Design a protein around this ligand. Structure first.
Ligand SMILES: *[C@H](C)[C@H]1/C(=C/c2[nH]c(/C=C3N=C(/C=C4\NC(=O)C(CC)=C4C)C(C)=C\3CCC(=O)O)c(CCC(=O)O)c2C)NC(=O)[C@@H]1C
Ligand SMILES: *[C@H](C)[C@H]1/C(=C/c2[nH]c(/C=C3N=C(/C=C4\NC(=O)C(CC)=C4C)C(C)=C\3CCC(=O)O)c(CCC(=O)O)c2C)NC(=O)[C@@H]1C
Ligand SMILES: *[C@H](C)[C@H]1/C(=C/c2[nH]c(/C=C3N=C(/C=C4\NC(=O)C(CC)=C4C)C(C)=C\3CCC(=O)O)c(CCC(=O)O)c2C)NC(=O)[C@@H]1C
Ligand SMILES: CCC1=C(C)/C(=C/C2=NC(=C\c3[nH]c(/C=C4\NC(=O)[C@H](C)[C@H]4CC)c(C)c3CCC(=O)O)/C(CCC(=O)O)=C2C)NC1=O
Ligand SMILES: CCC1=C(C)/C(=C/C2=NC(=C\c3[nH]c(/C=C4\NC(=O)[C@H](C)[C@H]4CC)c(C)c3CCC(=O)O)/C(CCC(=O)O)=C2C)NC1=O
Ligand SMILES: CCC1=C(C)/C(=C/C2=NC(=C\c3[nH]c(/C=C4\NC(=O)[C@H](C)[C@H]4CC)c(C)c3CCC(=O)O)/C(CCC(=O)O)=C2C)NC1=O
Ligand SMILES: CCC1=C(C)/C(=C/C2=NC(=C\c3[nH]c(/C=C4\NC(=O)[C@H](C)[C@H]4CC)c(C)c3CCC(=O)O)/C(CCC(=O)O)=C2C)NC1=O
Ligand SMILES: CCC1=C(C)/C(=C/C2=NC(=C\c3[nH]c(/C=C4\NC(=O)[C@H](C)[C@H]4CC)c(C)c3CCC(=O)O)/C(CCC(=O)O)=C2C)NC1=O
Ligand SMILES: CCC1=C(C)/C(=C/C2=NC(=C\c3[nH]c(/C=C4\NC(=O)[C@H](C)[C@H]4CC)c(C)c3CCC(=O)O)/C(CCC(=O)O)=C2C)NC1=O
Ligand SMILES: CCC1=C(C)/C(=C/C2=NC(=C\c3[nH]c(/C=C4\NC(=O)[C@H](C)[C@H]4CC)c(C)c3CCC(=O)O)/C(CCC(=O)O)=C2C)NC1=O
Lengths: 172, 289, 162, 197, 172, 162, 172, 162
């Protein structure tokens, strides 16, 4: 995989030049952003079970056809698999937030997930709605001002939202 | 190794992941990580609930009552493995599943399927599973203490058919063997009986044309027998594998996946017609010389 | 390419759990030394041409037979000298990539793994590249946090070739 | 090259939407998208021969043996087989050499697009496509034409389109009627010394 | 195209009326001699190659300028096309005999064939003579009493003769 | 129009060959069905006026809103009832034509072609004509081969509208 | 394609042998069952629209997660394609019943259909369920004793059930 | 192949329609003459050896140059006589296949398609096979429904060879 540093490293090595000053200043700005990035990772990790359970509640509230006898999330095994899917998508979203590049998300989390969902008959639009609900919960929890030092964090919030959007788009 | 196409083919999460080996005086988290790696590999990335967790074999591995090889053997003898892979599949599918799980590679020739199916029918499933475990390839790859792993990289004594058939079996890191496009159909019956190789189509996400599967009949062959002659003035010919054509409709489009051989001069147009159609190009292979 | 962030994510994925406080400390160590790594990489980027030319001349002084006898593996002609300058530029650029990344991952995925087949197949002595990396060790002019981090990658490339 | 000069479309039956059930006077779809017997593949090849060469040039010397063999193996699509019939030596000598560019454009539009030419202006517009790009360039233009595709696509033998309307004994004249050559090549063969008594 | 049923259906739909008793009795009569119709179609189909070969041979016996060098049937290719024209005309006469209506013969064979033979330089009088020779050959073959159940068949023979005369008049 | 005879020829024409014994067996099945079709059409022609009036009354019974709501498409006034009686007359006449022809060709080239856009631009419900064809299928009184081959056309027009 | 006669003919030609008396007796039994076969074809054809409509209604009743938005039979175009697919599969089942062999069903409908559905993201398990609903509707309509001469028709019903099972197994 | 059932299904599939009463009548004629075709095929199967031997002798009587001139394509030796008997057995077996099937499809797939290249490549005169089929016509012994069905395939192979 790649993080925010090794993505630029791999691009420079494929081009075969040293990093210019603008790339090093952008990486220094990423380093300054890193404390807020680690705060975002810590907050989503600390509220992960609540995010997954509340997003599952909202998803099976507004789409009750999934839990109906015969639905994709019906049966303890299929529901437990759906909850583990929500947990793993949230976990790889935190992984992509931690790295600063999404390469872990396409290389591991979305690498054949659409094949899995098409093969099993999993409705990928329902999974996209679930990832939307985890995005709403995670962006509400990261941007919470209580118990943390103040400062603008719109960049890491937009980056987490982009990770969630490309996670939901790979299955929809 | 595999570097540039590793992200596309799904090799990269296995490229930065080292083989899991249990040390002779191993810690508890080492035993738990061998347990997790065996449940991912041997059970083929299926979700494993707590009711089917096989606590006895885990407990025997945790104190060293059995080795990693014997733990792999025990979880392959188990009813969970048989109901996942044996009881609801063709015997070629079972053979290629045991090759992917226990040996981490696709079956090479027809003779391997011959040997394993004959030994199964002669001596049953457990005897066959023991033959995968008690193979010289298993000892020179994993031995007694290493969990089996997918071997995409070139080793000593492999075949280049196994590289392509590995991605016929491996369909992504986010994917299980039960959750693939051929739901129970063996992917290598027509590849091992005819000794042919289909083009490698990568998994979802990285490859837009991930969903190309060939039909059982009416398929365009890989090599252009004829060359430029049916196309008039041409230099090179390319087989394009096209996925999910749905723009005209049923009368016009009978099959979503289409494989065609087109020249250089028709290549731009062919690409353009795929784009206009909304089709996804799976792979383009040089069909002529 | 291995890096504290990527190896932390790969490890926590191997246990299949969320990023605990350990990986948060991992990225905090990455943050506290990433600025020095970027500054060292910038200094090596500015001084790279003189460093590569001086390292090539240090190899040609320690191993003068490379500039005298004929052969494809030697730098007796302009083609061999261009190949040697290109190789030392590759070594220095991957050291800068390791400084930016924060680990030997660029070295492992680009230079370290496989260099033994390079040296045996093309009859290249690893002692030449060891002497070159010793010249970058002795002449990069970094201090403190930037010096010790850059010397770690130069030693690791030396340690793999030796 | 140059863009084709604009020509106005003349109303023909294929321009409007077909409000019909196929039934009696529908042209049978000769398609390879369904898996076929070798007999059905032979009737499909004979249908392509009957469309391109007419009934008269269905002789053994005009059979493209290697093209048929490649088409059976699905080396080529139906459109590429139709191209190979149009690029055939027999087609070039019998049809193209005995006609000017205008009547050959009319012949190829009728036998590939399945519709008549709109006017003399369309024949004029595609005759310079013949005159610059050769016969292969022209056939390729006609076979890559959206018309050819939206009507026949890649895997269907072309057919005269909307020749006859529902509940009509007679419609437009069939494309089979058109001869290899017009009256100009007729009187030129008469002038060189043929056909007299 | 029409047959003996759909033609009468077409005038009935043109008048917008149901068929009378006399029209249904006439159609029942056509069903009654349908067996002799199928016999006539079978006999011409079975002896089609003999009819084409013998009539072409007799036509080029009486008209030697067609087989003389320079003739319209003067090559292997033009003779093959002329025999194919005989086969085609015979095929469409059998189609009209099968239907009981010459709508398929007038539609897909005869309309525009005169202008085609004029534009080719094909002598339409010679094609009419060959079609007439096919008429006596086919009518002698149909009226063969051997190997068939005996009965009156003058209606279907007159219908075939009318189809052949209409085919000859379309090219003459 | 679609009919065993015409279809047999069309096949032999598209393959460019003479009428084989396949085509003759097609004619034989046409011959054995044609007498039953002609007697069925004779019976329907005799019972035509009562069947049209009963079918129109059954459509008014199941759909009474057509006889009470004002509009061009409804049978509230005398012109709408006349157009409806003409519609079931057209339906029954083309069913008799299909019986005489021995195929669905009169329905295909007379009524089924373009009935959908007729029903939507004149705001006609196809279910009215479906219920009329149910009355024709229930009150035609045929038996044996005449019953099944007449019903095949009535369900063909039912499946075309629905 | 093949029918019930040409399947035995092709097997005999692959053997290069004349057909034995058991094969002639089996084909004579097929001729005896042919009237019931034509009745079954006629009944499924005459109730095809009712079969497709009722099977779709029951399918999207017991699996309502496909007509809800984001589902695969959601939108008019998708739902029209689903109804058309049901009509096409039922039509090819009638074709295979008519021929007495599943060659046309397997080669012109079932060949590549699973591949098409997994390429388009169509859930083939739901299509298989709809094929079973068309199965139960068609075998209920065929086995109806009303309006037909009473007789044993269990072989034709089992053969239609076999074609429907082949259609269901080839979409998932 | 070309049989009434297969051709009816292929026609209805090309026009994208269900099996109307037209195709039902196609199958009705198929059922009407299928029993006669089967028992004709059985009569030819039982009399096949005598029919092939008599047809070979009739060809040798009409064309004695085949049994007296040296050549690969001629039946002067015993090998050529075995080849001619095998050829006439092939022709008669495909005739029985066509009688079973109900159309010229076994002829079109097994004998007609490619017989011209064989006859011109291996120097076999088609008039020999025409005379053999005329003997099979004159000596099959079938009457009524079987005779006209059998001679349709006999004449179809005759017109394909002539
Ligand atoms: C016997 C009547 C006919 C015959 C058979 C034959 N079969 C094979 C080979 C294989 N058969 C199978 C079948 C199965 N695999 C499964 O998993 C199952 C169910 C559990 C079945 C039924 C397989 C997989 C093979 C391939 C392995 C092998 O080669 O043994 C052969 C040999 C193949 C070859 O040609 O090399 C043969 C000969 N052959 C006949 O002529 C009879 C009609
Ligand atoms: C004769 C020596 C042997 C034999 C031959 C046989 N071949 C085929 C079928 C095909 N052969 C080809 C080869 C080519 N087509 C081309 O255009 C070219 C180059 C221009 C080549 C080399 C192809 C494409 C086919 C399939 C398409 C077709 O049928 O024409 C067959 C038919 C097999 C079948 O059952 O369909 C046969 C019998 N068979 C022998 O037994 C001899 C050893
Ligand atoms: C209905 C129960 C389910 C469903 C169906 C659905 N299908 C499509 C699209 C296609 N279906 C086909 C199938 C065929 N091709 C053939 O040749 C044959 C037999 C001759 C068949 C049956 C094809 C080719 C297409 C794509 C072309 C087209 O649009 O017609 C769709 C549309 C998907 C899309 O628009 O991308 C749908 C919705 N969907 C369901 O949810 C039910 C389980
Ligand atoms: C067929 C196998 C199967 C089982 C067993 C099953 C159980 C099951 N019960 C659930 C919820 C629930 N179950 C209860 C049950 C109770 N609350 C109480 O106070 C009572 C004491 C008690 C009843 C005995 C409640 C309140 C919820 C809702 C939880 C929530 O929305 O957060 C959910 C969450 C998803 C949903 O809302 O539907 C599942 C999956 N689902 C299955 O598919
Ligand atoms: C191992 C566990 C651990 C963590 C995770 C951690 C994070 C951490 N976050 C910090 C800062 C910060 N964190 C934020 C984050 C935010 N501010 C906001 O108002 C938003 C709601 C929010 C984005 C989610 C900001 C703005 C700073 C100060 C700027 C910076 O230091 O980068 C700091 C600097 C010291 C401080 O001022 O508190 C630390 C150490 N320290 C630890 O020991
Ligand atoms: C037993 C027979 C056999 C063969 C032949 C074989 C070929 C082979 N070559 C590979 C890679 C490779 N091959 C090359 C070769 C080249 N790159 C270039 O630019 C040059 C044109 C060329 C040298 C002539 C490279 C660069 C890779 C690595 C690709 C990557 O990094 O992803 C791989 C990927 C697996 C691995 O490297 O471990 C295979 C399997 N494998 C086998 O088992
Ligand atoms: C790389 C990390 C990773 C991912 C992403 C992953 C996904 C994943 N989800 C699966 C199943 C599943 N996923 C779901 C999920 C859902 N069903 C619904 O209706 C909802 C919309 C949704 C939850 C929000 C269900 C129901 C299954 C089980 C399907 C079955 O067995 O029938 C499976 C099949 C194997 C198994 O059951 O364990 C995989 C591999 N696995 C992984 O290792
Ligand atoms: C399906 C209805 C139909 C028919 C029958 C038809 C006839 C027809 N006869 C042709 C040629 C011909 N037709 C003949 C026939 C004859 N020549 C003679 O001298 C004899 C009098 C006569 C034999 C009876 C010949 C010789 C040609 C060859 C002309 C040539 O190619 O130069 C051609 C042009 C050949 C081509 O385009 O390749 C057509 C279209 N067109 C139709 O649409
Ligand atoms: C599939 C092949 C096949 C065919 C073609 C066929 C035709 C056929 N022609 C018949 C009758 C007949 N065919 C004729 C025909 C004629 N009588 C004459 O003397 C004239 C020479 C000649 C006009 C060409 C007559 C008069 C009848 C009896 C009347 C009738 O049945 O319509 C019959 C009634 C049964 C019989 O008495 O033989 C059949 C089945 N049967 C088959 O199985
Ligand atoms: C062109 C339209 C048309 C059709 C389709 C048709 C079919 C037809 N089906 C028949 C018989 C029959 N049909 C059946 C069928 C069945 N019996 C049952 O109780 C089951 C519910 C059912 C299976 C679906 C049976 C048992 C016979 C009598 C045995 C036989 O004739 O084969 C008969 C013999 C005459 C008769 O006794 O009615 C005909 C003609 N006739 C026509 O004109």
């Amino acid at each position: 995989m790649f993080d925010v540093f090794t993505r630029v490293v791999s691009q420079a090595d494929a081009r075969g030049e040293y990093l210019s000053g603008s790339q090093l200043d952008a990486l220094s700005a990423t380093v300054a952003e890193g404390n807020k990035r680690i705060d975002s990772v810590n907050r989503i990790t600390g509220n992960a079970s609540a995010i997954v359970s509340n997003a599952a509640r909202a998803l099976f509230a507004e789409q009750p056809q999934l839990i109906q006898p015969g639905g994709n999330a019906y049966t303890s095994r299929r529901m437990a698999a759906c909850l583990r899917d929500m947990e793993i998508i949230l976990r790889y979203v935190t992984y992509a937030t931690f790295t600063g590049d999404a390469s872990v998300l396409e290389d591991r989390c979305l690498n054949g997930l659409r094949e899995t969902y098409v093969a099993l008959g999993v409705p990928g639009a329902s999974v996209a709605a679930g990832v939307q609900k985890m995005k709403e919960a995670a962006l509400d929890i990261v941007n919470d001002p209580n118990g943390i030092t103040r400062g603008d964090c719109s960049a890491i919030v937009a980056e987490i939202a982009g990770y969630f959007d490309r996670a939901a788009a790979a299955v929809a | 190794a595999i570097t540039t196409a590793a992200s596309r083919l799904g090799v990269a999460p296995y490229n930065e992941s080292r083989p899991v080996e249990l040390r002779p005086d191993f810690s508890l988290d080492d035993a738990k990580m061998v347990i997790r790696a065996v449940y991912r590999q041997v059970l083929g990335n299926d979700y494993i609930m707590d009711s089917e967790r096989l606590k006895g074999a885990e407990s025997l591995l945790t104190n060293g009552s059995i080795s990693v090889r014997e733990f792999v053997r025990t979880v392959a003898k188990s009813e969970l493995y048989k109901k996942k892979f044996l009881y609801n599949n063709f015997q070629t599918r079972v053979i290629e599943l045991n090759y992917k799980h226990l040996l981490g590679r696709a079956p090479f020739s027809e003779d391997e399927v011959i040997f394993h199916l004959d030994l199964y029918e002669n001596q049953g499933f457990d005897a066959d599973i023991d033959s995968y475990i008690d193979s010289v390839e298993y000892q020179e790859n994993f031995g007694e203490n290493i969990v089996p792993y997918y071997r995409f990289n070139n080793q000593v004594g492999d075949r280049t058919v196994g590289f392509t058939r590995m991605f016929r079996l491996y369909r992504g890191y986010a994917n299980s063997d039960r959750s693939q496009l051929e739901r129970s159909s063996s992917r290598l019956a027509t590849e091992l009986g005819q000794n042919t190789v289909s083009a490698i189509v990568g998994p979802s996400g990285s490859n837009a044309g991930w969903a190309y599967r060939p039909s059982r009949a009416g398929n365009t062959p890989a090599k252009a027998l004829g060359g430029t002659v049916p196309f008039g003035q041409a230099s090179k010919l390319f087989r394009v594998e096209i996925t999910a054509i749905s723009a005209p409709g049923y009368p016009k489009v009978r099959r979503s996946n289409k494989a065609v051989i087109v020249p250089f001069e028709q290549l731009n147009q062919t690409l353009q017609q795929i784009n206009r159609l909304g089709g996804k190009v799976a792979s383009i292979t040089p069909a002529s010389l | 390419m291995k890096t504290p962030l990527t190896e932390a994510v790969s490890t926590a994925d191997s246990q299949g759990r969320f990023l605990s406080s350990t990986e948060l400390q991992i990225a905090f160590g990455r943050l506290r030394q990433a600025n020095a790594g970027l500054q060292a990489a910038k200094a090596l980027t500015d001084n790279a041409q003189s460093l590569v030319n001086g390292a090539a001349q240090a190899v040609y002084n320690k191993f003068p037979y490379t500039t005298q006898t004929q052969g494809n593996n030697f730098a007796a002609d302009q083609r061999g000298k261009d190949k040697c300058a290109r190789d030392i530029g590759y070594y220095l650029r991957i050291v800068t990539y390791c400084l930016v990344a924060g680990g030997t991952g660029p070295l492992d995925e680009y230079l370290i793994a496989g260099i033994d087949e390079i040296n045996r197949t093309f009859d290249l002595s690893p002692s030449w590249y060891v002497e070159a990396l010793k010249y970058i060790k002795a002449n990069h002019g970094l201090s403190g946090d930037a010096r010790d981090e850059a010397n770690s990658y130069l030693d690791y490339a030396i340690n793999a070739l030796s | 090259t140059l863009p084709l000069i604009a020509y106005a479309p003349v109303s023909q039956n294929q321009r409007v939407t077909n409000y019909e059930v196929s039934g009696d006077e529908h042209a049978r779809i000769f398609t390879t998208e369904g898996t076929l017997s070798p007999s059905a593949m032979d009737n499909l090849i004979a249908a392509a021969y009957r469309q391109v060469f007419n009934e008269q040039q269905m002789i053994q010397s005009n059979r493209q043996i290697a093209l048929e063999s490649q088409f059976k193996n699905q080396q080529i699509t139906v459109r590429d087989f139709i191209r190979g019939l149009a690029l055939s030596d027999s087609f070039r000598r019998r049809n193209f050499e005995v006609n000017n560019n205008y009547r050959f454009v009319q012949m190829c539009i009728q036998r590939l697009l399945g519709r008549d030419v709109y006017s003399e202006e369309e024949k004029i517009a595609w005759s310079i496509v013949i005159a610059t790009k050769g016969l292969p360039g022209f056939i390729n233009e006609l076979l890559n034409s959206q018309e050819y595709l939206e009507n026949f696509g890649y895997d269907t033998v072309p057919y005269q389109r909307r020749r006859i309307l529902p509940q009509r004994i007679s419609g437009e004249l069939p494309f089979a009627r058109m001869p290899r050559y017009g009256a100009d090549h007729r009187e030129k063969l008469e002038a060189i010394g043929y056909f007299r008594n």
